[PDB]
């Protein structure tokens, strides 16, 4: 279907205990493919997906250099932000940044992103027009003015609409066997008696890829939200995902309920019923 590439950067200050901890990761859809950890010994951008390992030495030297540069600008940012918010030089603060692009099933640029957060809340973000900025608060206005004077939007737009989507397409093709193929969810339902009056039906979806999936319960063919529970989709640890949805039902009424599973890896939605 549609695809995306994203880079996630987290920098955490550690006053009096050395340099800020900087962690960078790159994803294509739900698959991580690179990372950099300021505290690791390698000091290099490292591969985390097989398909990116076929990139040559210039790719790695370049990404290593660029990621270290992102590391340094964030080191400066923490100081700048501590200032904008008149905060103590002693506390630990967190700056986060994310940028990347989305392409549609036709592989054409669909949307781009470039945004920052400080201490858990939005700070500034590039709007969908890839032209203007949204400063989350008063302090961010300074950055907004600064970025407008330095034409940061123009530079980002060229990268998001060009370079970003071009490399995403290259990744999608080199890694087609794992990024463009699907792994259908293996499903089953379990029954747990809660009491003599109620029972819990739990619908399972395991070992699927991509992560996107829809689990819904119906009673006599009508969607059911009440008395249901849906856990967050979670990583199995091998590249696939898991998720379950549960509904508490009156004893003896189990047969009225059906679990519906929608996923790109299925020729058609699946329907499960107890027994």
């Amino acid at each position: 279907g549609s695809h995306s590439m994203r880079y996630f950067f987290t920098s955490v200050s550690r006053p009096g205990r050395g340099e800020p901890r900087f962690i960078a990761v790159g994803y294509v859809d739900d698959t991580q493919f690179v990372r950099f950890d300021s505290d690791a010994a390698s000091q290099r951008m490292e591969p985390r997906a097989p398909w990116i390992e076929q990139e040559g030495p210039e790719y790695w030297d370049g990404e290593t250099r660029k990621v270290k540069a992102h590391s340094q600008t964030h080191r400066v940012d923490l100081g700048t932000l501590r200032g904008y918010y008149n905060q103590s030089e002693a506390g630990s603060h967190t700056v986060q940044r994310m940028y990347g692009c989305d392409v549609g099933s036709d592989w054409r640029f669909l949307r781009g992103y470039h945004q920052y957060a400080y201490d858990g809340k939005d700070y500034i973000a590039l709007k969908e027009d890839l032209r203007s900025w949204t400063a989350a608060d008063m302090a961010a206005q300074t950055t907004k003015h600064k970025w407008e004077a330095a034409h940061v939007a123009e530079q980002l737009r060229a990268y998001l609409e060009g370079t970003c989507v071009e490399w995403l397409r290259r990744y999608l093709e080199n890694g087609k066997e794992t990024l463009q193929r699907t792994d259908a969810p293996k499903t089953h339902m379990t029954h747990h008696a809660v009491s003599d009056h109620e029972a819990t039906l739990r619908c399972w979806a395991l070992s699927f890829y991509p992560a996107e999936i829809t689990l819904t319960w119906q009673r006599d063919g009508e969607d059911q939200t009440q008395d249901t529970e849906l856990v967050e989709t979670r990583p199995a640890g091998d590249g696939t995902f898991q998720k379950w949805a549960a509904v508490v039902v009156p004893s003896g009424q189990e047969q009225r309920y059906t679990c519906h599973v929608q996923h790109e890896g299925l020729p058609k939605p699946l329907t499960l019923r107890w027994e």
Partner: peptide, 9 residues
């Protein structure tokens, strides 16, 4: 591939 230019808040 990463963006190649420095950006400072």
């Amino acid at each position: 591939l990463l963006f190649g230019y420095p950006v400072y808040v």
